[PDB]
Design an enzyme around this catalytic site. Structure first.
Site, PDB file in Angstrom:
ATOM      1  N   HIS A 137      32.686   3.222  72.950  1.00  0.00           N
ATOM      2  CA  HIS A 137      32.703   3.270  74.408  1.00  0.00           C
ATOM      3  C   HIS A 137      32.375   1.931  75.054  1.00  0.00           C
ATOM      4  O   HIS A 137      32.809   1.677  76.183  1.00  0.00           O
ATOM      5  CB  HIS A 137      31.721   4.322  74.926  1.00  0.00           C
ATOM      6  CG  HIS A 137      32.099   5.725  74.577  1.00  0.00           C
ATOM      7  ND1 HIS A 137      33.301   6.287  74.947  1.00  0.00           N
ATOM      8  CD2 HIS A 137      31.429   6.685  73.896  1.00  0.00           C
ATOM      9  CE1 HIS A 137      33.358   7.530  74.506  1.00  0.00           C
ATOM     10  NE2 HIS A 137      32.234   7.797  73.865  1.00  0.00           N
ATOM     11  N   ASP A 174      36.101  10.883  67.033  1.00  0.00           N
ATOM     12  CA  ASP A 174      34.975  11.296  67.855  1.00  0.00           C
ATOM     13  C   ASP A 174      35.484  12.166  68.998  1.00  0.00           C
ATOM     14  O   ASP A 174      36.579  11.947  69.523  1.00  0.00           O
ATOM     15  CB  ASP A 174      34.236  10.066  68.388  1.00  0.00           C
ATOM     16  CG  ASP A 174      32.958  10.415  69.118  1.00  0.00           C
ATOM     17  OD1 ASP A 174      33.037  10.982  70.225  1.00  0.00           O
ATOM     18  OD2 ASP A 174      31.870  10.123  68.581  1.00  0.00           O
TER      19      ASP A 174
HETATM   20  N1  LIG Z   1      27.543  13.871  77.599  1.00  0.00           N
HETATM   21  C1  LIG Z   1      26.635  12.814  77.359  1.00  0.00           C
HETATM   22  C2  LIG Z   1      27.348  11.643  76.770  1.00  0.00           C
HETATM   23  C3  LIG Z   1      27.718  10.583  77.597  1.00  0.00           C
HETATM   24  C4  LIG Z   1      28.396   9.464  77.054  1.00  0.00           C
HETATM   25  C5  LIG Z   1      28.695   9.424  75.673  1.00  0.00           C
HETATM   26  C6  LIG Z   1      28.334  10.454  74.871  1.00  0.00           C
HETATM   27  C7  LIG Z   1      28.678  10.381  73.353  1.00  0.00           C
HETATM   28  O1  LIG Z   1      28.370  11.254  72.624  1.00  0.00           O
HETATM   29  C8  LIG Z   1      29.391   9.200  72.845  1.00  0.00           C
HETATM   30  S1  LIG Z   1      29.683   9.323  71.016  1.00  0.00           S
HETATM   31  C9  LIG Z   1      27.635  11.610  75.433  1.00  0.00           C
HETATM   32  K   LIG Z   2      38.176   9.931  70.020  1.00  0.00           K
HETATM   33 ZN   LIG Z   3      31.194  11.018  70.885  1.00  0.00          ZN
END
Ligand SMILES: NCc1cccc(C(=O)CS)c1
Ligand SMILES: [K+]
Ligand SMILES: [Zn+2]
Ligand SMILES: [K+]
Length: 609
Positions: A137, A174
């Site tokens: 991300h 993921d």
């Molecule tokens: N809902 C909460 C959240 C926000 C942003 C990212 C994630 C992940 O699990 C990324 S692997 C979870």
């Molecule tokens: K993905």
């Molecule tokens: Zn995730």
């Protein structure tokens, strides 16, 4: 040839956590790494891997995917107190900071680069990096979604810079959409990025329109970014396998990547509080296995998400199991993908069809038995007993009344099958035979006699083989040259030249594997009558069924074909491969004929009467 799997992990990446109340980030805990490694230790998998040490990513390596202003701001966080850390974390979305997170982020990135270096230098065949924080991300100038630095985007840019790679495949399974990776390689056609993700019509985080199927890339990268949005929770094993068979694998094999990098987030597994999907951890054993024939097995699995401290360890173990070449577990209860998943698959196929023409639509492991005195991989051995000879004499006096060598070959068939099914001493085998009819009848009937309910027969050749398919206990996939129509629902007959390889590859990914996986056989019976240089990918991918229990019959000695079949059954790396309209028309007609019974063939939502 490289061997072994690299396992890069360090307990230091567990030395940072959330220091305030934040229900959004409470799932990302340091125990994710500890439970994962302890799970690999309890099952003895970590000991079988080469423990390559982690390292810090250098400043220049981090600048490959991030700006100097963002690197300097993160570099100042080790000196902040909790109040300053909370304010700094508030500047971004769904991420927290810690005095040690910059150190751990450099360790997660360096650990990934260590994995890439290990695989590309042929020090290991594949490997996994249990790292923290995740990366997919994080973007060029922002931390996002628990991520500080994009470890997988690092791996791809590092591989391109330091190994002159022209084609890399990134598979992000993921449950969240790695928008940071997409942004990084949006205009880059050298890094094909695939990502399925819980989307729910943009209502799920990160709530981006460019996470939909319509984002195919920009500029020269059009068609090299593939998003599969799940618009309903509860996606099962059938939904994931349909995604691979009808979207990922055909594009992946046509792309022919020189390196496969997996953004392995296991929040897409059953039980995870964020994914809310229903895919068993065993599905990840197959998700990696179906990708291992790519790039000569050079796969770099990198940990992303996964927040159920039970399914995470199970899914990590399944992935490492397949990286080590252990027999994949049988998946039962497979069927058609749900309507929402079929809608998503159909939509992404249609928009990607302008870049991948296969999406267009009309309006001891192995036992070797060579001929007597033919005269081998280290995990292979050669081949009778009193009960085996007595059984052979009974089969002869009963069915094959009125040749010592052929009877000896039948005895080898019985002994190999007894050692494959009735024990774990041998996984698969290959036998060279002369008389096809007698050998096939002995192999199939003895396999059904021993505990093997369903048998998947894969016969490459012409003519009719003595195998009855009108019972449900046997499915015959025949790769022939002449057309024999297609009447029985338990028979997939394909009569596919230069494009023949690609056509066979399309028929293997879009027809053979979905039917075989739903069939869930207890034994695969390969037959080759006396072109077949796709047998390795076929034999490797078909080993995903029946816990790898496959018996291959080769009529006529071919040192090339025999060595290729033994190499594929033994689990060695598969060399890469680098579509006629009549072939794809015959394929879709076979799909329309069989998809009513074998729903895993469906890549479009079914139109009701
Ligand atoms: N809902 C909460 C959240 C926000 C942003 C990212 C994630 C992940 O699990 C990324 S692997 C979870
Ligand atoms: K993905
Ligand atoms: Zn995730
Ligand atoms: K791309």
């Amino acid at each position: 040839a490289a061997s072994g799997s690299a396992l890069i992990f360090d307990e230091e990446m567990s030395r940072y956590k959330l220091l305030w109340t934040d229900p959004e980030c409470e799932i990302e805990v340091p125990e994710r790494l500890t439970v994962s490694y302890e799970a690999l230790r309890t099952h003895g998998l970590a000991q079988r891997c080469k423990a390559v040490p982690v390292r810090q990513a250098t400043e220049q390596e981090i600048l490959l995917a991030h700006s100097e202003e963002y690197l300097e701001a993160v570099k100042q966080t080790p000196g902040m107190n909790v109040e300053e850390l909370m304010a700094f974390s508030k500047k971004y979305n769904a991420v927290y900071f810690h005095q040690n997170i910059y150190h751990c982020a450099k360790l997660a990135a360096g650990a990934t680069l260590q994995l890439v270096d290990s695989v590309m230098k042929r020090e290991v065949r594949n490997g996994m990096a249990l790292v923290r924080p995740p990366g997919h991300h994080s973007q060029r100038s922002a931390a996002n979604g628990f991520c500080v630095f994009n470890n997988v985007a690092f791996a791809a840019l590092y591989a391109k810079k330091n190994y002159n790679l022209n084609r890399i495949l990134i598979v992000d399974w993921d449950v969240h959409h790695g928008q940071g990776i997409q942004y990084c390689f949006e205009e880059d056609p050298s890094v094909l990025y695939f990502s399925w993700h819980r989307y729910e019509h943009q209502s799920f985080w990160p709530n981006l329109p460019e996470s939909d199927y319509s984002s195919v890339g920009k500029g020269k990268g059009s068609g090299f970014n593939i998003n599969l949005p799940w618009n309903k929770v509860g996606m099962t094993n059938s939904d994931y396998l349909a995604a691979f068979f009808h979207v990922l694998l055909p594009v992946a094999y046509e792309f022919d990547p020189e390196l496969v990098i997996v953004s392995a987030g296991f929040d897409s597994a059953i039980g995870d509080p964020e994914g809310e999907m229903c895919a068993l951890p065993e599905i990840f054993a197959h998700l990696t296995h179906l990708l291992m024939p790519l790039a000569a097995g050079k796969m770099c699995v990198v940990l992303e998400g996964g927040y159920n401290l039970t399914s995470l360890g199970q899914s990590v173990c399944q992935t490492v199991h397949s990286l080590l070449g252990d027999p994949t577990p049988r998946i039962s209860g497979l069927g058609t993908a749900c309507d929402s998943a079929l809608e998503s698959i159909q939509n992404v196929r249609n928009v990607q069809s302008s870049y991948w023409s296969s999406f267009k639509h009309l309006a001891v492991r192995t036992v070797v038995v060579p001929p007597p005195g033919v005269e081998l991989p280290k995990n292979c051995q050669h081949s009778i007993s009193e009960s085996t000879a007595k059984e052979v004499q009974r089969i002869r006096d009963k069915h094959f009344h009125d040749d010592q060598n052929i009877l000896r070959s039948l005895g080898n068939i019985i002994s190999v099958l007894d050692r494959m099914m009735r024990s774990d001493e041998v996984c698969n085998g290959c036998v060279v035979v002369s008389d096809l009819s007698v050998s096939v009848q002995c192999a199939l009937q003895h396999a059904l006699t021993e505990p093997a309910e369903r048998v998947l027969v894969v016969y490459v050749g012409d003519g009719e083989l003595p195998v009855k398919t009108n019972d449900g206990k046997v499915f015959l996939v025949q790769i022939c040259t002449k057309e024999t129509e297609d009447k029985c629902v338990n028979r997939l007959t394909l009569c596919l030249g230069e494009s023949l390889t690609a056509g066979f590859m399309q028929a293997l990914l879009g027809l053979i594997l979905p039917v075989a996986y739903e069939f869930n056989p207890a034994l695969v019976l390969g037959i080759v009558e006396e072109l077949m240089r796709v047998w390795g990918h076929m034999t490797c991918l078909i080993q995903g069924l029946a816990r790898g229990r496959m018996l291959t019959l080769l009529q006529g000695y071919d040192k090339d074909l025999l060595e290729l079949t033994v190499s594929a059954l033994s689990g060695a790396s598969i060399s890469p491969l680098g579509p006629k309209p009549e072939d794809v028309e015959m394929m879709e007609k076979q799909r329309q004929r069989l998809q009513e019974r074998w729903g895993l063939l469906r890549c479009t939502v079914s139109e009701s009467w």
